[PDB]
Amino acid sequence: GLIRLQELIMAPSRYNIRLKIRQLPIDSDDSRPLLKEMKRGREFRIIFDCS
Amino acid sequence: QLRWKHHPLDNKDTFYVNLYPDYASLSHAILDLVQSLKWRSATVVYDDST
């Protein structure tokens, strides 16, 4: 997904969006710390690459 | 082996040896470098995907 995401990563040549990046847990399914982090992050528009 | 290739986890061979350096070590090196530089602006310059 990073290979097919880097286009959107460099795409703010055209636009001024703010954009961060995080990873799912690579082996575990306890993403609940990350979700706690994004709850602290006060964001409302999140990209999801997954099965 | 000498160069690098991506290797997944379910990818489960046994018989291999490489000498390419691990990327996370390299990014850690650049991390402590720019932390020795203490910057707030950055700019990614690169050729391709990898």
Write out chain A residues lying below 8 Å of B49, CB-based: 3, 6
At A11 the three-state DSSP class reads helix
d(CA A17, CA A48): 17
Three-state DSSP string of B1-50: CCCCCCCCCCCCCCCCCCCCCCHHHHHHHHHHHHHHHCCCCCCCCCCCCC
Nearest alpha-carbon partner for A2 in A44, B3, B16, A10: A10
Residue type, B45: V
Nearest CB to B49 within list A6, A26, A27: A6
Minimal Cα distance from B10: which residue of A?
A: A27
User: Can you give the resolution of this entry in Å?
Assistant: 7.6
Minimal Cα distance from B9: which residue of A?
A: A27
